[model samples]
Target chain A: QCLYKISSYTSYPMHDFYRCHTCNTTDRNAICVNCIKKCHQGHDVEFIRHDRFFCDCGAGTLSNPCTLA
Target chain B: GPLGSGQCLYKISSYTSYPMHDFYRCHTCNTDRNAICVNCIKKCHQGHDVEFIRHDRFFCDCGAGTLSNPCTL
Candidate 1:
């Protein structure tokens, strides 16, 4: 299967951060470039252009925090 | 996962930043199939076959081409 790959982090395209709907897990509202490249490598990632303070997936943002530990 | 629409974009000017580097997906191997930074292209992959994609932006890292840390700036 063709896994959804993490787009390299750069200073263009404007949208560097990413939101993954597949994993559906986060609290900071977004994932880091490293996370996008490692954790959500296979999931469909929705790239955003915001620097988030928390992951915004999995059981809602205020409910369960991102377990990216 | 279900697909959702609607998008929001944020723009910030004059923030300390790093050079925009390119990302890539390697077709030749499975271990390194994920996104790779610009440095990974020249150092890690080198002669290995790979595919490249352009991303919007990123923070340069050790993966960036033989470059020094942003602290050097």
Candidate 2:
């Protein structure tokens, strides 16, 4: 099953935070970046897409809906 | 848990200065919750994503709602 990952300090699409192995990093700032890559990797991770939504990394904003699996 | 909802959109316009919360259900995932993104004057809440947008516009991947694929901005 594909598990949606995210940080515990975001406020864009929703107003909640959860900790997972996907973006768990000692460094808060670094973790944020890691989350971006995690989704972009598209191998073990990918950006959960939606309408009018864009990734924090700003790679393909409103371009294509990507999924990890 | 029900990880439903595609991306519930919330707002906090500069003119209003209030949070516009809205709940949505993800057709692909199948989850539900309050509006994800809520904007403010000083800062914006992208929730779990930690990614804010223009004029306080965010996806708020905390529980519901989310940004599009390859979010490189």
Candidate 3:
């Protein structure tokens, strides 16, 4: 589970997490860069920095699976 | 215990001079509208993983509607 494995503050400190507007679900907000560059590419993703959050790529929040996993 | 949202925010931003208060939040703790005041940042969130919320509005220890996280005054 990417949501369980993903740690924005520790694992990907140098990277930016995202919220996919295209995903459009209650919890499909936070996603990792790999999920953005690959899985969620061309989608309406919003870049989020500073705030610590988990990737919802593999979570039931999104229609796509986590590519990083 | 639900921390007390101090008057730090309202206290600092007075007279409407500096309407913009320094709003920060400890996302590691709460993801709600829980942004903190300057005092809330330096003292309360000493070790807590926090983020400097570049706000277009305001916040720091207001409970519910805005900062739902109980501010630890």
- Best-fitting candidate, measured by TM-score? 3
Q: Rate residue A40 of model 2 by lDDT.
A: 35
> In order, what lDDT does every prediction score?
0.44, 0.29, 0.45
Please give the ranking of all candidate structures by TM-score, highest first, separated by commas.
3, 1, 2
TM-score of 1: 0.26
Summarize candidate 3's per-residue lDDT along A10-53 as a digit string, tens digits: 66533345666776642334555555566655877777544233
The model with the greater lDDT, 1 or 3, is 3
Q: Write the per-residue lDDT of candidate 2 for residues A1-69, one digit (tens) a residue.
A: 333545422334443222233433321111133444454354233333232332322222222222321
Of candidate 1 chain B, the 10-residue stretch with the lowest lDDT total is B64-73
Candidate 1 chain A has its poorest 10 consecutive residues by lDDT at A51-60
- DockQ-based CAPRI category assigned to the predicted complex of candidate 2: incorrect
Angstrom error at residue A59, model 2 = 28
lDDT of 1 at A30: 47
Check candidate 3 and list the clashing pairs: B4-B71, B5-B71
Candidate closest to the true structure, highest lDDT: 3
TM-score: model 3 vs. ground truth? 0.29
Ordered list by lDDT, greatest first:
3, 1, 2
lDDT of 1 by residue, B9-44 (tens): 232322323433455554544352245445554555
| Tens digit of per-residue lDDT, candidate 2, span B22-58 | 2222222213221222232112222232323332223
lDDT of each residue in B1-73, candidate 3, tens digit only: 2333455555433534453323555665463435355454455556767767442222221211122222223
Off by over 4 Å in 3: A1-15, A51-69, B1-73
Native-contact fraction for each model?
0.03, 0.00, 0.00
Taking all chains together, each candidate's TM-score versus the true structure is 0.26, 0.20, 0.29
